[PDB]
Design a protein around this ligand. Structure first.
Ligand SMILES: NC(=O)c1ccc[n+]([C@@H]2O[C@H](COP(=O)([O-])OP(=O)(O)OC[C@H]3O[C@@H](n4cnc5c(N)ncnc54)[C@H](O)[C@@H]3O)[C@@H](O)[C@H]2O)c1
Ligand SMILES: NC(=O)c1ccc[n+]([C@@H]2O[C@H](COP(=O)([O-])OP(=O)(O)OC[C@H]3O[C@@H](n4cnc5c(N)ncnc54)[C@H](O)[C@@H]3O)[C@@H](O)[C@H]2O)c1
Ligand SMILES: NC(=O)c1ccc[n+]([C@@H]2O[C@H](COP(=O)([O-])OP(=O)(O)OC[C@H]3O[C@@H](n4cnc5c(N)ncnc54)[C@H](O)[C@@H]3O)[C@@H](O)[C@H]2O)c1
Ligand SMILES: NC(=O)c1ccc[n+]([C@@H]2O[C@H](COP(=O)([O-])OP(=O)(O)OC[C@H]3O[C@@H](n4cnc5c(N)ncnc54)[C@H](O)[C@@H]3O)[C@@H](O)[C@H]2O)c1
Ligand SMILES: [Mg+2]
Ligand SMILES: [Mg+2]
Ligand SMILES: [Zn+2]
Ligand SMILES: [Zn+2]
Ligand SMILES: [Zn+2]
Ligand SMILES: [Zn+2]
Lengths: 352, 354, 355, 352
């Protein structure tokens, strides 16, 4: 089979590979629609997770089951499925402690395009189908369902980690796709004021749609001063770090109130340092909690978010600004995430 | 001053009373708009909180400050305020443990028409004005703002106590005003499926507006079987008890999954004991947590809910089906809560103004 | 093989049964030491969980692995293991939500002598060996190690559900073996005052050892009034329900403060009603949270409690008052739990495999 | 009255001062025993909290009430009291949100020797006596009781923020007085393995007393390698940062497991920034939560910790290595915290 792969660091290309075979508890899936993620750009062109050889990329897909192992009981060939980007090994001690994302190692619940061939191929492999797949509703648009696999679960996890209260003020730094879902998720945890911080105009209309009450552009002043001006010097209750470089941590600490929470869902791949400013952190005693986590996956998470979409708790269509048709456009779409034209949020490639 | 009072158990009426005077840290407030609560029907006609003599009723009001004590620093006469129904004494050991609602005693954070003259008078008294009042925005409709003081904070507390997750399935038993904010709150905590249980048609359209995805009527079959049929025998993640008798706890325990949470905000005014169905509670070992709490009050809560309204997170106007103009209609409005016509959710009395 | 079984309701006896075989992920264990639980007396003589026929009893054992399935990777024949009484199925949606105890159904994590042949036999079956077993330290006395599997994990779960704070006052109702570990667990969560409620003298000394600061006897006065007298009318922050009848729930609600937490680990097997007293529950608005749960099992829990014993955080030997030697004494030991002589807390039967 | 004060940065001295007068809700207290804190050395000689002029130092005291305001109801002159180092303003919006320590500002619940004349004087002022004092039990040694006001509440808060579970493995970095109470607190939250990190033998012996199962000395190797060797490369569940430089945060992140919690109770007085190591933090996605908080105060905290001492849950006497008798020795004791002989844990000055 053909697949679009990281040959090595700074090298992309189509490769031929043997089709994966399903173990007793696994499924082989054919993609129906996929989306590129900025995490693959960090991975390929920055070596943020180390070096790889012939690793098929991509981890956002909805697909059709083509083969199942003899012990798979809830899915069969022909079933259409939402595939969460995180597919844990459920029999691990980390699962017993409540951390499916790190089953058998740090980030090891995220396999696709981390250390396992991803979804940019004619077929891909899902471990433990009954625990890690969910049925795609018959009338749900493919582009919407692909947004569940990563953008929605990651952005909402930012809001869950932030422990938002009814009426909390929230700053979301970085209003790309993940930050837009952080804004939506904060609204769905009861946030009052939500300030988005970014410089891209396409995201402003989407950010307001999902629930932003204020938009700040760093280009017209240092952002902490801008936030202090908006909040009369009081700061905000919660900060979600969804995009930008490592210096946003220092910004988040400086704008959150004592007792507040900072929630990172941004993947920090770069040579910039994550620095906590000492004085604004109350010399370590200001109860400014800092969290950061890989998104949950598995069947339960996927089915619960699927129900949110089905009952219209969030309209995911606003994330998808570009739609391509055909394997041939996977390369162009991924390179789009590297260059980022001003009007791109997420791109979806539809396979026929 | 004039006030509408509980004369005793089973007796309502207008009374004349001396005006309250503010202590050094208190405010005297004038109502601008008020609403009757079903809890006052429990208090007066069931003696659910004991006996009272000439207690002015009501605890849902927005008003104008007319007088403040010498140590009040953030409010002055003329300020228009949202008055939370719960107004705690903030200097207590219960406050140090995080339970403002019970500062200096069980439920003692709720004073108005519990053991303190309430808001159905020409003036009423608010303890610790700086800690217990919030400014009413100039452009907020009065009838919407009165819904903050009790319905919203109670309904949202129900959803807060339920510890809802992104996509949790939720049943709300009782879709009166409080349950409607339970539905709204559950949606604003990320609930997926929301099943409302009630028999009153007026609440059906409001429930759908606030986020209900299914509506069950108990009159056409035992409600647990109905929920089991909707959920393929699996039950739901969370139950909020917002209305009905003591038997709703048994229904909630029976329809919630093992590991789930039951969140009671219903004020149970009759019966000696609430019954836990033993087998459906896993004989005590099914991890079906049971909670129940008085709504939070105080300035911080009121300002945070106010911000939710100001930023259009919830539209409170759908709660208000009846609006009167004039102080004197407090009597008719409260009596409406006793008789409950088919089309009532909440009534607001707006006092005459220019 | 021989196994000590519930022949029917009200009938105990030895039966011959096929020796279990392990599936690919399972282990077969030979018991080295076992303990009878009061719940098995309830099952046989009260039919509290329904009717069973020829179910081998017992769910407290440490043992030796004799056979493992072809996919077992961390345990091998010859390993000595602690077997938690709760051995969940780990591949379920309830596990993904964090409730191992109810994987694939309410209380379905408790298999032994619930709906699965238990440990009172020559061999028994453990599902998912890699997820549900823990290595027994070579120098840990067997009778101590058996107390981990049920008594320690249940009592400590009572203290965990109670969400104790540094200095909380705690009442533990029923200071049998489980309540004794409830006392120990409460101390190990930072409790200040710990009031034990019981009438059995043997438990009083153990209760003081494990951390009780006061002991109240229900027989000489209404306990709620007694607790109010001890606390100058203020009540307590937390209640752990570990023994007694269904009426202890109402008593717990009446003695806990507003905002407090009641934690049930007592299995209410009788048809007596569980009642929340309305006025003392603030008519539903007093923030008196009621929790209740089956004890966690699995490898991680067993290893974490094992480390606590190894590092001397709790001395389990005070639970064991009776030690037998020989498979034959299982009947006598189990019947001891039915009658409960004045000097019994827990009994352990030590097995001596031979030809 | 006389008091030992921070004249400015790098200037200590005795000053003459007016005796404070109690407002309607306050108490004036005469100290019976006091203790110097390392935090005062940060404040004076590092200017960690800004500049001060003639601020009386000290915030660990037990005393006798000599005067109360007209509205004080539970305390009267002659009462002997434990005075928590944190004495919040209880009527603030931060109290309504559950953060007494930051009432009316970051760290502002801690007044003594922060921005209020402290306890190293003949008298000092306690705001809101009914809310901020606790009765000293008749039979409690004074030197033990002084350890409640700061060392016990701070160390235990470290264990509380750490969210310890029954059997959690815990590393405590820095085994001075606060770290010793972190060890004691971790044990009283049910920790199994407790690893103490320090190089001072007296603190090692005390750490074993309070519950440490292993002791690591930084002098025989990088402590992360040592912890990884002790845990066969698995790491620990929880880390409490109780002493050391800013780099201890990086060390904590490297030794804690994915999903673990790092709890800072160390007052960081120097440096611009604390660095979070990127890869060891899972590039932001390892669910390694970082907390850090000023100790709780107020009457309820002091009474609950007092009950723990009365019921022998913790023996505080092992904290006290140096005892002076006489007001005159306040200067010598505080300078001891600056020099720190190898066998010092805490010093107490007993006043007559
Ligand atoms: N597979 C996974 O586990 C996973 C999934 C989703 C996201 N992530 C990570 O989360 C992050 C979010 O993804 P995305 O698609 O939103 O990224 P993105 O490329 O859209 O960047 C986010 C936004 O932040 C803005 N930004 C850049 N610098 C900024 C600054 N200094 N201040 C404020 N805003 C700034 C950019 O304009 C951009 O719109 C990514 O870095 C990604 O690697 C990982
Ligand atoms: N102390 C306070 O401040 C406070 C605040 C809010 C609410 N409360 C209490 O909360 C409760 C809710 O108040 P409300 O204004 O919604 O009352 P309500 O009169 O609207 O009653 C709620 C609804 O529940 C329905 N119901 C009755 N029996 C039922 C059953 N067996 N199953 C299902 N549904 C049933 C009724 O049809 C009604 O429409 C009240 O009992 C009130 O006392 C107290
Ligand atoms: N299935 C399981 O895994 C499991 C595990 C542990 C415990 N449990 C359940 O937990 C309970 C604890 O068992 P145990 O071994 O401690 O039983 P036990 O026989 O030791 O009984 C506990 C104590 O409660 C006392 N008591 C009786 N009535 C009382 C009252 N009114 N007030 C206060 N105390 C009273 C009894 O005298 C006894 O002292 C059992 O009922 C059991 O069913 C179940
Ligand atoms: N708000 C308050 O008043 C308050 C309360 C409690 C604690 N604190 C702060 O908490 C800290 C506690 O100080 P203490 O007196 O308990 O301890 P301490 O002053 O003895 O210092 C901790 C010890 O750890 C050791 N150490 C140094 N570097 C290390 C490293 N890299 N790894 C391991 N160990 C190392 C040193 O021997 C040092 O003495 C202080 O810095 C203090 O400022 C402040
Ligand atoms: Mg970015
Ligand atoms: Mg479109
Ligand atoms: Zn991604
Ligand atoms: Zn009301
Ligand atoms: Zn048992
Ligand atoms: Zn200090």
């Amino acid at each position: 089979m053909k697949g679009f792969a990281m040959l090595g660091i700074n090298k992309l290309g189509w490769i031929e590979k043997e089709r994966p075979v399903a173990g007793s508890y696994d499924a082989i899936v054919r993609p129906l629609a996929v989306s590129p993620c900025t995490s693959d750009i960090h991975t390929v062109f920055e070596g943020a997770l180390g070096d790889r050889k012939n690793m098929i990329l991509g981890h956002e897909a909805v697909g059709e089951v083509v083969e199942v192992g003899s012990e798979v009981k809830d899915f069969k060939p022909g079933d259409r499925v939402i595939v969460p980007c995180t597919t844990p090994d459920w029999r691990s001690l980390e699962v017993q402690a409540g951390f499916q994302q790190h089953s058998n190692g740090m980030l090891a619940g995220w396999k696709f395009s981390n250390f396992k061939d991803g979804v940019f191929g004619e077929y891909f492999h899902v471990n433990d189908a009954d625990m890690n797949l969910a049925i795609l509703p018959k009338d749900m648009p493919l582009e919407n369902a692909v947004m569940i696999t990563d953008m929605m679960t990651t952005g909402f996890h930012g809001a869950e980690l932030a422990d938002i209260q009814m009426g909390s003020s929230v700053v979301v730094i970085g209003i790309g796709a993940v930050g837009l879902m952080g804004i939506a998720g904060a609204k769905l945890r009861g946030a009052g004021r939500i300030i988005g911080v970014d410089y891209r105009p396409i995201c402003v209309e989407a950010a307001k749609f999902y629930g932003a009450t204020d938009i700040l552009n760093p280009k017209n002043g240092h952002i902490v001063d801008q936030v202090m001006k908006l909040t009369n010097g009081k700061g905000v209750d919660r900060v979600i770090m969804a995009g930008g470089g490592s210096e946003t941590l220092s910004q988040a600490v400086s704008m959150v109130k004592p007792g507040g929470i900072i929630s990172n869902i941004n993947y920090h791949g770069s040579g910039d340092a994550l620095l906590i400013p000492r004085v604004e952190w109350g010399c370590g005693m200001a109860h400014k909690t800092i969290k950061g986590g890989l998104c949950p996956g598995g069947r339960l998470r996927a089915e619960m978010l699927r129900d949110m979409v089905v009952y219209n708790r969030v309209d995911l269509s606003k994330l998808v600004t570009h739609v391509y048709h055909g394997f041939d456009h996977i390369e162009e779409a991924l390179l789009l995430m590297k260059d980022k034209p001003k009007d791109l949020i997420k791109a979806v490639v539809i396979l026929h």
